[PDB]
Amino acid sequence: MGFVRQIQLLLWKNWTLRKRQKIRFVVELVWPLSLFLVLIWLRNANPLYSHHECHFPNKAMPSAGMLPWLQGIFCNVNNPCFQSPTPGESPGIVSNYNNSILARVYRDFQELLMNAPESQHLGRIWTELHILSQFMDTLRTHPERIAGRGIRIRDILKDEETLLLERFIIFSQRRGAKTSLSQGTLQWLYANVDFFKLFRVLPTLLDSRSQGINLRSWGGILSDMSPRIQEFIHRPSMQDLLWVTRPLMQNGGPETFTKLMGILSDLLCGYPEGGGSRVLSFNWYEDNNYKAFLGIDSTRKDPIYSYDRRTTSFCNALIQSLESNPLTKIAWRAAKPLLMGKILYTPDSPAARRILKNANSTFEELEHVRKLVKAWEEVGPQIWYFFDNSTQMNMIRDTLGVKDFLNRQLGEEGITAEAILNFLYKGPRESQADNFDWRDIFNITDRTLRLVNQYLECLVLDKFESYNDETQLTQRALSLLEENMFWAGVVFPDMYPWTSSLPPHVKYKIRMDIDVVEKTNKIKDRYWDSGPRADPVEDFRYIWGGFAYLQDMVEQGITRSQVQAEAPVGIYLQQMPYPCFVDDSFMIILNRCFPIFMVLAWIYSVSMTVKSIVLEKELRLKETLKNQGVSNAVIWCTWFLDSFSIMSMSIFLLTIFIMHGRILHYSDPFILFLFLLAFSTATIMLCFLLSTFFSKASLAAACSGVIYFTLYLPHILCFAWQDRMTAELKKAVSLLSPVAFGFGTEYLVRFEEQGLGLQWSNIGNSPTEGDEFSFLLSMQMMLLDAAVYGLLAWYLDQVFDSFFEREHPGWVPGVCVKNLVKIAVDRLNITFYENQITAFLGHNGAGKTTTLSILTGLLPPTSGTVLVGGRDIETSLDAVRQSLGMCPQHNILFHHLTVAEHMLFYAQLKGKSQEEAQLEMEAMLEDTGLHHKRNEEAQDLSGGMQRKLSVAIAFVGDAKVVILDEPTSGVDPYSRRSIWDLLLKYRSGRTIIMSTHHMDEADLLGDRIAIIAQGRLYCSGTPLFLKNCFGTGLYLTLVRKMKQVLDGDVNELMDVVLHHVPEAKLVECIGQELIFLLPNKNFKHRAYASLFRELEETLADLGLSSFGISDTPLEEIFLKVTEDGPQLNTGTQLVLQHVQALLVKRFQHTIRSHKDFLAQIVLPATFVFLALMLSIVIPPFGEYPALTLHPWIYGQQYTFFSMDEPGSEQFTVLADVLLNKPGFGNRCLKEGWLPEYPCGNSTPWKTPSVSPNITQLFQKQKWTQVNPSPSCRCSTREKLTMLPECPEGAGGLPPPQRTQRSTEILQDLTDRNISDFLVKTYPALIRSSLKSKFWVNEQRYGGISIGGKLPVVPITGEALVGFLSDLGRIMNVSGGPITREASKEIPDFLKHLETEDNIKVWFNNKGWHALVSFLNVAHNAILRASLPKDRSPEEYGITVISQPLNLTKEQLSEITVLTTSVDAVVAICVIFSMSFVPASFVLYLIQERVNKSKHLQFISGVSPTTYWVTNFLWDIMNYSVSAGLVVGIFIGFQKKAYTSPENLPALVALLLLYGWAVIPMMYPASFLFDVPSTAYVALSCANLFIGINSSAITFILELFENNRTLLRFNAVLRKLLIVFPHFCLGRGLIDLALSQAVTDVYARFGEEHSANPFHWDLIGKNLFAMVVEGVVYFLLTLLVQRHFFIVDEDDDVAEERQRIITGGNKTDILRLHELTKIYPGTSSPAVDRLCVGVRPGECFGLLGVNGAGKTTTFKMLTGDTTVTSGDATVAGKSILTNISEVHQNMGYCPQFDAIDELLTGREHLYLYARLRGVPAEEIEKVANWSIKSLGLTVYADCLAGTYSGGNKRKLSTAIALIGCPPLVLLDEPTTGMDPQARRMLWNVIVSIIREGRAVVLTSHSMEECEALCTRLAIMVKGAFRCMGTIQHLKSKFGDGYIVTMKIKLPDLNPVEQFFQGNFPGSVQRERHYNMLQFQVSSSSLARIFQLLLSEEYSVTQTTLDQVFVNFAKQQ
Template sequence: MREQRGMELPEKDTKGKDRRDTLEHPTVKDFLNRQLSEDGISVEAVQNFLYKGPRENQADDLTDFDWRDVFNITDRSLRLADRYLECLVLDKFESCDDEIQLTQRALSVLEDNRFWAGVVFPDMYPWTSSLPPHVKYKIQMDIDVVEKTNKIKDRYWDSGPRADPVEDLQYIWGGFAYLQNMVEQGITRSQVQMAAPIGVYLQQMPYPCFVDDSFMIILNRCFPIFMVLAWTYSVSMTVKGIGIVLEKELRLKETLKNQGVSNAIIWCTWFLDSFSIMSVSIFLLTVFIMSLLSPVAFGFGTEYLVRFEEQGLGLQWSNIGNSPMEGDEFSFLLAMHMMLLDAGLYGLLAWYLDQVFPAVDCLNITFYENQITACLGHNGAGKTTTLSILTGLLPPTSGTVLIGGKDIETSLDAIRQSLGMCPQHNILFHQEQPQTTAGFQVPLMLPALAFLFLISAPVTWVRFVPLGGMQRKLSVTIAFVGDAKVVVLDEPTSGVDPYSRRAIWDLLLKYRAGRTIIMSTHHMDEADLLGDRIAILSQGRLYCSGTPLFLKNCFGTGFYLTLVRKMKTIQSRGGRCEGTCSCAPKGFSVRCPAGVDEITPEQDLDGDVNELTDVVSHHVPEAKLVECIGQEFIFLLPNKNFKQRAYASLFRELEETLVDLGLSSFGISDTPLEEDAPPEGQAPHEPEEPSIALNTGVRLDLQHGQALLVKRFHHTVRSRKDFLAQIAFPATFVLVALTLSVIVPPFGEFPALTLHPWIYGQQYSFFSMDEPGSERLAVLADVLLNKPGFGNRCLKEQRLLYGGISTGGKLLVLPITGKALVGFLSDLGQIMNVSGVWFNNKGWHALVSFLNVAHNAILWASLPQDRDLEEHGITVISQPLNLTKEQLSEITVLTTSVDAVVAICVIFAMSFIPASFVLYFIQERVTKAKHLQFISGVSPTTYWLTNFFWDIVLVLGSTGNRKKFEFQSLY
């Protein structure tokens, strides 16, 4: 239809027909072709565009786009634009009967993001025809675009202005200030019946220079917890370990009070003790800061070196004493000085410690040929240091060592020709056979040594490296080769088995002749058996030295008298039942008629204990019975105040009355340092046959499992930790999760806030007027400084705050030229007076509060003189809409947060149960109970299966009522 209408239009257009006829004229066509040839347009193309006939009659070499296509495209575009323009609402204002209706309408429009603001006049009604003198109005906007009214400023002050255009100036970019300005200007024009004489502009107050330290902002949130954690352990250990808690537990505080110590003295001593401990930390921190530690000084110096390199200067002699940072007094040169000072301090400290804590102090001892001297002492007594000095491994700080009349400091090479040693660690060539190692050190091995250590015992070699015991024996062998006259052995029997230990003992005793053997040991029995002389060292000093007999006489307790009682046979008569009757009914004592009398021999110990004790005490009153095991009685006979006749008479009486006393033998022995090892080749003790039948196989495993279940039951019942971990804590966390799952987070409601300056308390404001001679501005200044004053409250003593007012026109500074002066004078009549509001945005609502102050001042300055200024005013209230999209999203976030907390509570609840199971096995491992059960016969399979069964039973019991407490999934 459109195309047909387009075809009819040119027929009615006679001018169009004339144009087409003109283009058909040859002269016109030729002229136009020449004129349009530069633009690439021909007359044929124009005729084709204006063609009105059927499209099939158009020329094929020309485009088929003509005026009809343009008409159709234009028609479709206009219709499409008309359809879209129907969606535009040109009427931006809607009136509502009351505030409730406005709120409902605003919320519905807000869902489509088509709501800007709502203005409510609470003191005006639909039938009101004029404005009241004091106009109150309320602006309702989305909470996303205005400041929240539940706060008026930041809780904590921070450096820097609130100048972010999105986060801090919401009254500007949200449009609240513009709407307030329009409404209050309209109120002013309505009240004074004239256009607003003075305009208003806003300006944020300038802010001084500040440091934007984002690190401190981050540290502000975590620094308190770091400080608390840093001092928690120190304070808790001070309270517990110093004595406040410990002394109360041990009743020491009450004991001190009973002895007359006052409570004040006790607390003072606790304080001094705690302060002394804390002062150590303070001293170390001070030392660290002063660079008295060489790594600290070196680190600081390296840092300054790198900083100079970063600046492209490098460390030079010209700047070695300067700092790359402005205002810093530390330098690389000072770091070098501190390192030199540290070196001196360390040297002084090393010298002092070497003098105060020597390893060997004033040691004077003589070792004899053909003797073994055993050195005894605790760890750190100085044994190894002494032997190292004897062999030349360590030089003595003072004194000397003479070996065979030769000084070890001057003739060490000659001494080493006849010196052999075996240190604590094995010195071997591990890639060689033991025969090769010994052969490398001496061409000719002693036959006895080779037979004893290399041939007598079978040895298993792994990569040509002997086992630990064989390595030790080989090291001892090497110490004797080469016809060594002085042999130094440092703990030669450490790490060897008893058989090899006995072999080393025999070696030392066999090759003692012609040699001076010096050995160190920790075993008292070894020193007693091998040592011809024993030297005891303590803290680097020689405590005592002498033969074993001499030491026993000096420090021994006496002799052991061992009495062995003999066994005697006793004939006992008893009955043996051969019948099938019950021989011993419960509650009766009868003789079984089927019983047969028989005589059974029994063994019993002969001799009376009291009689034996009296005999020994009669001769030696100081004797003590120290042990009574089986047939043996052991008495301790002291060696102090030794009475030879008393001992002789005791032994004589024991020999004469041996049988009468019921003894089989007796003996006397010296008190050994330790009991000797059992002799070799002793037959192992045959175990006795059990008197009851033993379970084996599956029955034994079941018995073990039953015992383990009983043990777990008693442990669970008696352990409070298991009760808390398996029942109390999971139930508590599940209860918290269920409670949180039904809690509905409260909706955030923001109250209505009247915007006036005095909501910030008493602060200071300023006032300035740029045109003192202006009559209108003088009136404005008068109403601000006098009555009614700032805002709409008439309080003479009220000092306003968080803003200021600047009145007067802005004077332009122009170059004094004729043209500029004429233009300025011509535009001067169009310049209006402007009132500027300077606001400090630290107060969230200072901007709109002082904007209201400015409009009130303009209103009062513009009112006629017959009006009462104290009755007129403008009050603005900000009340954000509740239940907005932002609040709904916050509720969603809160709900999600609650779900996350519920999930965490459930995870914690379920984690306590397996943790309690693991804790039991950890306790079993720590207390060695698990190891004890394994060596007692419990198989690992039975142990783990039984405990797994018990844990599964507990888990099933705790999850048996899951349907009762079932709630919806958290995700």
């Protein structure tokens, strides 16, 4: 035998079959690639974002002064990222602003001019210049000497002597004023007293009032200070200042608002490397925008514009020109509520007033500036006056500057001084001379300072308004907020309007709207992003929204109201640094789309494999191969390798595209191949399992892809609960292989993120930190699911005188049976011989099927043995199957396999090599007469030659024994002979056994016969022996002609046979016939011989046409051995009878069917229920929670601290109330604070332990201060990692730790670099905190750093007004009323600009509320660090709450969109669920359109209108029940908008009209589908493609308020899609929810809205469109159905001329003139002209040559198809105009069975009785009679459809015979009836004809058509070739008189010679041993010339089927 040869063979056939398909083959290799191209377009549409490190500057809170606060607002607007650590994140520094040119200028100034060891002596000059021009230069009132007065006084006095003088005066002074040394002394009675003082030209002795003199103590320093000043101007700092300020003054310089900001930035900020980078965000889905990516613009409407009361005419023009200008319009929107907003402080009481008094320092300090600027309006004119008309300016430097000694002093002056210009630019008034450098420096300062003055008064700086309850606050809040003038509103909940003293725990709320606050639902991003979260606009709403500034101000006030410390500390916020990173947005969609695409790419290749496996099992092609000797395992193992080699060829291309398409960049392309392979191997063994469920191929092909897809959906639910999925639930759910695929895909993507592939090294491990489910478990569980599926499918497949005769010794008995019994076969003993055909009879299986089974070898015997060549089968079960051939009743052929391939396959399977197999095939193709069309497909053969091939296969190889049962069943009489030729040819050397039931076939061929009576041989022998063993006489037939009234005179007919009358005579006389019956017995050759002889010449005299003399039928010899006009309803009553017959017909079918009760009821309810249940997992959003802000709302976490600046006081207690008992924050109060977060117990400081490798690394190696512990590898060029690699080189050693009794873990970072420790240990934290990528917590959120100081301004307060007042007094100003108050606050104004001793807090922006949670901790420790030393600071605290401000009807205009978008999906679920019932109603119509049941209804007369009307009527009422169940489920869920006393009518009407309008829509789909399953799965997809893409597009398309073409599309689709009801139901179920939302936001605040449905605005036009299209479609289905609905032979002449020219019907029933049926056109009509006529009492035959075209005659006669101008009439009317009047006078028995397989036998009769007549009380008796006539009473109540094989045919012949029609059409009314059953039908069909009712018959056999027909007509390609009776036609178109005789040691020499009398014939036909067949002539002379023989004899007439072969022979 073989085991590896069968496999080669089966592989060959399967490979050859999977080549003639060529459209499954192409799809199975192209569809996956067309599915993975989109996944490459998505790779290229989602690029990659990387960035370097980020170090961020810090932000000062108001408590850190005002100058740092405002400078930090302006400098850090964009929050820059700096790549290199900022100067403010150092241990002792906080400032962060060197390198501003305005600080370097100051440093240079203070360095070289000030602190001048050289001079430092301008103090002397100032003291002298002030002591003179304050005391002496005035002299206005004080008294003096002779030479003393205010302005001009002389000295001359005290002279008693009377008075060259001009010469003396000129010598005294040289052009000198009152404001020389010796010349007059040597020229000298005047030198006695008149020279009282020698005070000569020496310049310093005049002011000797009290004490003082100094002359050249001015120039010695005035020439000192020059070169240093010049050098200072030559420093680079002043160079840069002057350079930068060159624009910004020249001509429209500041216009670009990037030059201006650039100048200001380089001047005030100092930031390096360009400024910074501005990291971005890219999320939009944590914020629910849905219009950030969609392109819509998202702005609130700009607020109301109203002129205000008491602001200004400038502060109303600006607010408008700056707001309605669509270029700024947004910055202003954000900045306005801060600088003109307003703050509201509900609990108006003394204590809150004190808090808000102390919380007000910032605005006070900020109006101290407006006063100082208003003072210029007063001091301006005074400076003007002093510099224009003064006694000290133009009277000391313009009226002077001596000018002669002054000129001499100027001669030694500097280079560029210009005393002339120093006089022109020092008092020129009435000049208008011009530069001018004098007044263009003063009018400019006015123009630029009064402008600032009139800008600064727009700011509102009094903004605390009180109230008394929260409701009034909220009312004023929305009133202001619609104007854009609202800051927060503060609420002190636990105090009363009479409270006076503060409790030692104060809490408050900040209530702001939601656009400037973080949402209080979420506290994290749901999906982790790998980015710093440092975007200035979306990620910092607690800063530009002003929440943090107000929080700081109020906490400072609360502290200051109960501590009285008078030593402040400010707060700086610092953001923690972040490492390098890459952000890939593909890895989000890869992780979700890879498994979907992979599962969806095999969805077709799975179904087309279950299809093949089940189909070849449905054609019984598997039990054939199992009988032939093939084990089941080989079958499966070949199926596996068939399916495997196409998966394995598509995988090879998937790998290439995935790798080289850059979907995966670096991942070892061999492991991915070997990973997809396991999925394919599990999939195939799933197909093996799925096949063992189904029994019909078409159903499996549809239900299998659906199961494959459904099995994957658990991964959706396992992609949410990633948290509570342990290791075991991964090891257990992963038995479903498609989820084990996704569980490995996630590790694939997680590895690809890290910069690593899989690389054969990490697949066994996991990056998920000890989750013990590696990547290998996925592979190793798919390769286990395969084994489980295979080994479950295998088992589940398994579970499902004498009578015998003398036998010549010259015969070799090949097969011999020796008493085999089984329990059936009682003492059976027969021998089948060598070359001989044996016809093995027996009724059905009483001894035939059982015995043939053993002879074949299937089953063993019970008692006896069998020999095949002398060797029992039970002993040689295998090698005996070498000779046994066999063929079963059905065909054994493979579709798509050519004929020669069949011969080769079945030759080689028996055991042969290709050589001999090919040789034998070539011999067989020549012996079989199929050498032509040898390479044709096994289908598409004629159908008789399919049987010819199926019986030629049983002979293949060397078959010594052939068993074949009914080889010729069901082929036309011309193909039976073609088959018989084969058997008569291969008969030569092998035995053949031939079970059959055709009785003539057992005789025309067959050499022995055996009859199995009741389990035993009851006869045997040759046919002649059997005829003689029973021996009844001859059958003389006599046929009379006509001249109607033909003939019929038995008087002269019986008289002729009365002379030799034997025994029984006339046995029949049917119309124009005269059958007889006579014995043979006692030879009497002369007697008989003389009869025929004499009759021959005396024939034409009597009137007969001819005569025959047949023997005894073989069927009659086997038959006796086995076990032997009511009136009709019509009219409206008839129609009211039809409409009640059909309803009962459908009702009785639905009760008994349960596969209806599924798709009619169960599925709708379950699917809508699931939709609803997954619709309410979302609650009806309230307003917003409170969310007390404290740092434990995050999980376990690490905090830190850092005592910078130690030893100092107030910091060693601030560092202790923060670590020790009171702890961080506020959780541990002695009393309360949220008894949900408990307090525990602390542990001592404990440094962790370190690997020795590290400790060796640090002390041995030499590090630095700028380069501590080693760096981290960043993304290079092709190894882009998500986060850097970071070796065992973190910040350094682990620092001390602890566990605060809060349960946090703080670590002490004192004396260490923090921005090195934090950037390098972050990845090692979030690698252990990742592993899910949802709701990660990061374990580190903040820490404090106590210390930092910025150097404050050095000059004190009063020391500045002391100087300013003196400067004023020296120049006559004296200020006024405003100035004397602007100088009041100047000593307190300078202590509030900076703080000098202040802390900083570090925050991690990846947790949303973590800024204001640690700001509170800081402000909470500052309180406890300063309260008096006997109050136990464990009790004090402050807590902040948030609570946003109620939404405003436009905020909700988007929560509505986000809320109704789930109801827009429940609507699609409802449509998809309800579109199952109408698709179930259509499968029934398809089932009746095929199998011709509908046509059968129509023939009886059901007038298609009433058929369709009754179907629609039943379908509506059947659908109403499911609709009512859906209404019940909505009422149960009690939802609003659908089940409310005004939404029930809308919902119910909307549900009912849907079915009403959609049922008639899908009726036309019943005319173009012929397989129910394909129709179901092609309607369930249209009712989805039209359900989604019509209900959703309008919804999505309404959210575009612009483009003016999107609305153009929307408003016209909403009118163009109203043609079909899926739209009319989607736009109804969505609108009934939108209206509810809109009428439910109103009821939130007062507004009333009571809109109703049924109003044509929402659901009126829908309910109209449904009613109209529920009728137009129905009329369409009433029309799509209305479109559907020479010479001749010498015996055809009589029928030609009977009714054409004579006209002779006058009583006939089927006048049927020349009818012709021409197709559109091929050559000629299939039916040509034909004339026939049927009399009342005879059965027409109408045989017809097969294929020539006969069925078309019945099609025309039954109205099935259309005639081409014929003429056919029935008894009273015609066939062309009154067809409904001729379809009640005829039955019709279809060739194929047309019965509903769910009712029963009896109610088919009930139905068809009702469909025609039979009033109500007679149906009972009519149906009773019909059941017993045909013999059905045993089975008459057992669901036709279980009826075996002939009860169906009996039923069809019963219902065709109901009532009493005068015409009956029978089409092959006996097909699978055993030979006893046929008689019980033929008797009936003769009983009718005896009554005068005609019958037209048709059959493939020539037996029945000979048994009960009275005339025939053979049809050939034309019309006719004969008419007349049987006997009349045998002779007129045949020959015959076969003669047989046994030669009584026999020899056959003398017989041939003695046939000397009979030469014209004698073809001899046979001779085995002594039997002699012969065809003599037809003169019946043999009967007289046989009485001198030489034993037995016989002379029969040729059979009727010999005539048919003769007619069909020529064609």
